[PDB]
Amino acid sequence: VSLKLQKRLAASVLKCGNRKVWLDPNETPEISLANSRKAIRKLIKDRLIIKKPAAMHSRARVVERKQAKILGRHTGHGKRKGTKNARTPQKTLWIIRMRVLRRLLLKYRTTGKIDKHMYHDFYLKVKGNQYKNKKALMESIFKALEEKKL
Amino acid sequence: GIRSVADRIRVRMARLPIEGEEGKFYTLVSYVPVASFKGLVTKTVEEAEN
Amino acid sequence: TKGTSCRGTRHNKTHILCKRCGKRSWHLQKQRCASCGYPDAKMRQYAWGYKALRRRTQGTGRMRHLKIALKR
Amino acid sequence: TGHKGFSYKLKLGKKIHQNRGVPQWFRMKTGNTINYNFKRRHWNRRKMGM
RNA sequence: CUGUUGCUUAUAGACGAUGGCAUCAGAAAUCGGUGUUGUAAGCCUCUCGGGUAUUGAAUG
RNA sequence: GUCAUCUAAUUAGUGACGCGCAUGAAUGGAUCACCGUGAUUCCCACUGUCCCUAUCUGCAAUCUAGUGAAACCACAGUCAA
RNA sequence: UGAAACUGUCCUUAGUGCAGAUCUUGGUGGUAGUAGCAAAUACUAAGAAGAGGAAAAAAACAUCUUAGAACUGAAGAGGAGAAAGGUUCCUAAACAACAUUACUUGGAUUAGGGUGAAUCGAUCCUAAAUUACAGAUGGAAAUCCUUAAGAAAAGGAUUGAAAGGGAAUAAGAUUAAUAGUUCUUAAUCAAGAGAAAUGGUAACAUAUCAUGAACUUUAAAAUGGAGUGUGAAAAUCUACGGAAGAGUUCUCUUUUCUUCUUAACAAAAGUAAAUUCCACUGAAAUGAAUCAAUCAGAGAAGUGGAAUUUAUUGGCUUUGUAAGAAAUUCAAUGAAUUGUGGUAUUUUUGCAGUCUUCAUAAAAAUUAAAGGGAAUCUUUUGCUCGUACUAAUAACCGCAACAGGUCUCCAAGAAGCAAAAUCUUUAGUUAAAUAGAAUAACGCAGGUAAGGGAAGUCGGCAACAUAGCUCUGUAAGUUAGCAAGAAAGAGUAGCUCUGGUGAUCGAAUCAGAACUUUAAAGGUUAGGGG
RNA sequence: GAUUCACGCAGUGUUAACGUGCAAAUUACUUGUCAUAUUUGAGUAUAGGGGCGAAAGACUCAUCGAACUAUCUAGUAGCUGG
């Protein structure tokens, strides 16, 4: 006998594919009489039809690769296949820096460290690529504040 | 896989009567795993127990 | 590619069934029938088509009313 | 197509109805020569062209 | 007597053919010799280790 | 075509010469940067293209079971004169 | 042999004699049991059913289940549609023919069954265009005109889109097969029935409220593309805390894996991003701000407000629906659970400004508002038609189960700049013009090779070769833009560390230093140069 | 109307395969191209001394230096065959 109908109906009832349907190989005559979805539901209850577990796929190798890359184990020149701008965009570096530096100047003016006149000049200096990072801007502000206070 | 098979395989094949027709026999080849193949020769396995 | 390949895109009907003559001869874009000469009031017949005249003419059908009038 | 006109569907149904063979009792009539319907077709053999 | 057949047969070979043996036959593992690679797995040392080795290799 | 150059060797290539069978100015003449699945010549590198072939794999071809066409066909099918 | 018509002689009459016409039609040979049934990686074991794996190996055996081993690799050999087909859909019986062997299989034979809508479409509107009455034209057939010619149509007729516009439905379950269509629950829409208001300075706001005719106007439906930034959702990845189940386990692994969900339509605890307006004040020592810009006395910034957009009400969390569903487990129908986050990537969907055009990138049905001031909650109904199936290495077009052709939707992990090549998960499949033995020549496809290195050849044809990334360096010529990745040179692995780049814990990226080795892009991918 | 890779598409070479083929034009590799003079569906418009053509006498249903189909038509043949 052929259990093609039972495999198709069981996959619909169990909401899986035909590849996950397990029909009991010793109870073939019992399953053969299950020609309806209602009968298939009874067989599933009696464990004559079982949904196979999904194929195991682990991420252990990927996790250890990323942790090694965090320490820099595979970030060498022989492991880079994309250009410098492709790996780390040059535009997003600029966008991050302007948000970072404009945030700091905004905080200094609001708190009263710098007035609007000194804020305005530093805003244009920052825009003109004068400071590489946050620290370089802080020292220049403090250097200018001391010069003004003299 | 389909491309590689073990160089040496130890098998045990027994001849038993066919249940249906008594005159005929049939051979059942089964696989016996071994730790190593050193000093293993052809034998005859006999139960000889109650 | 003018042979086997170019025939793959043939899935748009030039002609559908005609209401007056029943043949798949109604040109959709021309809006007329190539066989019976539809909306034209007169049925389309030509003297060079002598076979087409004996395929659809008087007596080739049921003759529902005329079979009684003539015999009367 | 799934989408079709009503009268076109009825002409499709008629072509299904006409794709049938001679009934058995008709074949047992005296002086009968009609055993197989020669106006028969199948979807994969001849396209009915409508 | 010859042929078939068997040794999933070779000193032979597309198939035939040809050559050998056919119960003191043949086949098989195992062991030894002989080679190749390079020092196995558990705990630099075990370690000239481990693995392979007729399949068209040679003994028993 | 003649003279140079390219090679050991040049009916090929390039640079000159020009009474040019029969070049020539929107029949457009000359010029050429960049570009070209365009044409041509020479270098470097590389290699079975070659010296000169050897060898490895898969699928066929061989044989067998099942299945099974076509082209062609006067009759046919050894040579010398 | 054959079983019902026929013959001889004389005249008359002719569709009157075949070896040829590449003659016409039909039938049949040799070739010949020959060429072939060789693209699409691939099958094996046990069992069942069946007449159909027998046997001195006749070395191969179709269908179904299970186990193993595998392929397509999520721009698929996955899940669905448009056209086209037309019952091929589902089931049962049955296998004469058909699918280049066979078939118990089938898109094949026979007989039954199957397509359910107020909300999806057609129907409705118009686009390019198309066609009428009257009129104009023509010998005629007929052509022209489509609002101009008209005693026709307040203004102009018909048709034209299952991708354009458009009133309104979702979740779960269910069937051998249909399901935004059936059932349960919960909604929505249309058409019906039962002297005319307030608040706010303002922008504007009030579960119908709070009248609003003719006429007119405005807006919507309804409008290119590029590129940048960014809000939200989903998927993927990940942090914290677990609950339940499964995998490995004599070697370890507080371990690896799986589930932890929720609709339409509404509500309004809490809380966003962007833009545009309003009130106060009036900016020069000019300020404000963006990745970029851009803006300001026809009024900036600041403070306080109003509105709209963000895949239904109002964007997100949350709430009703609603856990009673569903998912994952356990017991033999009954019980358990169903937190909180992320300055990560991609897709989708909006938004904001920038750029570009000798290109400026539909209309109508239909809807709302305004100006004007004429007049004085419950319940009913919702018609017609399509709806099955394939949508393609077998349902379509090519004579066919043809390696050809044919418009779309959704879209996991690794690795990488990459939707590249390669491998895998969910799903699908292991059959897709037959195989077994042998391992000749000559082939087709893929390779390698001593020494030499184009001497081969019409010709470096074919093949080899170069190839990613970083740093240094880069000539003549030039339309000054390029040539340019010119050319040329050095570096690159593994392990253990350090430093730089932020916010009030996190991102992969860059630089440097020890030590070790078979001294490192090269498995795949990947310029030869002058 | 810059350079490239990918999904797709084409057709430079092998003058490879096949050439009674998978195919009355396809397959493999190499190569080229791969969004604005781009690609593509459906609707629609243009018809045979005509259409359409970034122009090859190209394309107009395997038919094009004048389509297909039917009639005149059993066209005529000093030429070939019987």
CA distance to A6, A10, C5, C27, C33, per residue, from C14 (Å): 46, 47, 20, 6, 11
Q: Does C52 touch chain D (CB under 8 A)?
A: no
To the nearest whole angstrom, how far is the Cα of D26 from the nearest Cα of chain C?
Answer: 25
Number of H helices, E strands in chain A: 8, 2
Chains A and C: 3 or more CB pairs within 8 Å of each other: no
To the nearest whole angstrom, how far is the Cα of C24 from the nearest Cα of chain D?
Answer: 7
Q: Does C28 touch chain D (CB under 8 A)?
A: no
As a rounded value in angstroms, the CA-to-C1' distance for C39 and G204 is: 65
The secondary element (H helix, E strand) that includes residue C61 is none
Residue burial D31-44, b: 16+ Cβ < 10 Å; e: rest: eeeeeeeeeeeeee
Method by which the model was determined: cryo-EM
Tokens of A87: 């790996």
CA-nearest of A31, A26, A29 to A7 is A31
DSSP string, B1-50: --S---S---EEEEEEE-SSSSS-EEEEEEE---S--TT-----------
Q: Is the CB of D50 under 7 A from strand G?
A: yes
Residue burial A135-146, b: 16+ Cβ < 10 Å; e: rest: eebeeebeeeee
Resolution (A): 2.8
Tokens of C56: 């659809």
Tell me the sheet residues that pair with C33.
C26
CA dist D48 and D41 (Å) reads: 8
Return the half-sphere exposure (C-beta side, CA atoms, 13 A cut-off) of residue C56.
13
Neighbors of chain D with 3 or more C-beta pairs under 8 Å: C
